[PDB]
Amino acid sequence: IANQPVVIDNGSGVIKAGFAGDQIPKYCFPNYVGRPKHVRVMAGALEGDIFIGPKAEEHRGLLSIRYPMEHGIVKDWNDMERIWQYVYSKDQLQTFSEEHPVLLTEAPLNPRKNRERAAEVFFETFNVPALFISMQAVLSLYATGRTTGVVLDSGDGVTHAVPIYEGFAMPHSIMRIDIAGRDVSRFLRLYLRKEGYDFHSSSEFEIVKAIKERACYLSINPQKDETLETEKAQYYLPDGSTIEIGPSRFRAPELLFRPDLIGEESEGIHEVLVFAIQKSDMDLRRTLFSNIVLSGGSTLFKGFGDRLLSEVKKLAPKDVKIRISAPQERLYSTWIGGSILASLDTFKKMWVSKKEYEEDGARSIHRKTF
């Protein structure tokens, strides 16, 4: 069909949607469904029990927040289907799903049953012409314009590192860990409660995320800043009330390098990057250390690169060149790559048509998916 393919980046934090060829995602909204907790008494009050995107952000206080996706895995499908209906609605893209093909960008090492169930939605519920699922890491390098390189994509839901050689992703060298941005936000809330600031409500947890995003830096030396008495840095809440954040600024983000803080038996983000390179063949290890690409929202912490670069050099072999490159638009890397892939004529052969799905079934996605 002549119609441009729609790129849908189903992220845990924010979903990035737009047409192939577009330089930036036109339609980016938070990935959760807000339902009103308060009772409607007056006539002429706000209509609907479902609010998505800017309508939910404006009247957030009325709503109870519930994210359908956890660690990049759709927990509630009923809500996820309604969000994709919102992606096509008059507020977002405003187009028929039957007219435009779809390009999905999922995390690596996900269950097969999820892709199978996701495919059912776009072929049965939506009569989509063709669906192709692609890796986030491979597209991230396509956006950067590099064929060989390591993509350390620390998202809100999941953190993974994929070493990719001349476009190809080595499936044995992929390392994936559940600990991500949302776990640091939970850890900050726990530490602020010990300081004596309570944020019990799901709406108030969004303020805790806003506090982290605005005022949170990663210390170069953790034990130095941990021991030293910290300046009580005040933050102004939406209502007007002032809270002293103080040491919680740098102690919260440490979770990424020390997973035992929350109590998870996993490797640190700096260990994941180095191990992923070391698993690769001797010839490529020096090039993978030379070409390191940062991605994901959880790398946006102040002084993240300085701390990570120090840890990589300590874990990495002696006399190895460690060059870590950060694109300014870290968040948009996955989507931009998808737009580039979708614009190619080779993409027509790559995706699975509706007719092909009906004949073979789930097999058609597994055969043609990379």
Partner: protein, 269 residues
């Protein structure tokens, strides 16, 4: 015979890790002149002895051995008995038994059973020692395994500043057997050796045992992760390299589409 010693050590690396005791004995009988070098150089499974004085099972090292007799760290006695009196100090006996108590709780938390023995000897600069940890899999349980670890530590105590230099060498030897009906009888052996050097602050709040304790568990964690991820991963990759379940004809179809993409990417420049 220096060339035979190299050949003997190089062979032991390739021979099965369970047959090291029998295979080492044969090499010693062929070249008995290098018996001391082969016994010292080649890593051997840890022997266990029962101390009838305290009533505790202790692991045997090279440091506690005075001639033929081995010293038990709990009793501070040589078996068979000796009147040499090689105990370096009374303060060492207090620190050594306290150290054993510290790593006795450690093994009960992490390993849950087994044996741990801490042997300290005094030196002119600062005390050194070895920490032996051994954990055996349950016989009745289908799963069979054997953990061996040797942590050699040398502490160089500074005159002023109280910032001793901690030199740790760790040699781990792991046996694994999985008797799952699906696979058959899988046996995956391995051995790793690493070294670490740090300069921790010594005090009443931060004593020697606390400074060493953190360094010992930190090395075991790095080795545990590296073995399970890097070495056990590479092993799986080679097995999948030998045979494929998917036909190559079907693989070449996907490779042709991937190759066509790569050409279309290099094309559009």
């Amino acid at each position: 015979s220096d060339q035979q010693l190299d050949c003997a050590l190089d062979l032991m690396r390739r021979l099965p890790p369970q047959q090291i005791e029998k295979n080492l004995s044969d090499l010693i009988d062929l070249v008995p002149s290098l018996c001391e070098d082969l016994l010292s150089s080649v890593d051997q499974p840890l022997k266990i002895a029962r101390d009838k004085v305290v009533g505790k099972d202790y692991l045997l090292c090279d440091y506690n051995r005075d001639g033929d007799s081995y010293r038990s760290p709990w009793s501070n006695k040589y078996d068979p008995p000796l009147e040499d009196g090689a105990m370096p100090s009374a303060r060492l006996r207090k620190l050594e038994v306290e150290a054993n108590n510290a790593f006795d709780q450690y093994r009960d938390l992490y390993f849950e059973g087994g044996v741990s023995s801490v042997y300290l000897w005094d030196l002119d600069h600062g005390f050194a020692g070895v920490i032996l940890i051994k954990k055996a899999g349950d016989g009745s349980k289908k799963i069979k395994g054997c953990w061996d670890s040797i942590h050699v530590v040398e502490v160089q105590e500074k005159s002023s500043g109280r910032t001793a230099h901690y030199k740790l060498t760790s040699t781990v030897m792991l046996w694994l057997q999985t008797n799952k009906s699906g696979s058959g009888t899988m046996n995956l052996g391995g051995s790793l050796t690493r070294q670490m050097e740090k300069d921790e602050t010594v005090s009443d709040c931060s004593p020697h045992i606390a400074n060493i304790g953190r360094l010992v568990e930190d090395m075991e964690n790095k080795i545990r992760s590296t073995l399970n991820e890097i070495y056990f991963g590479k092993t799986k990759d080679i097995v999948n390299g030998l045979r494929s379940v998917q036909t190559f004809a079907d693989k070449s179809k996907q490779e042709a589409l991937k190759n066509d993409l790569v050409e279309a990417l290099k094309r559009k420049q």
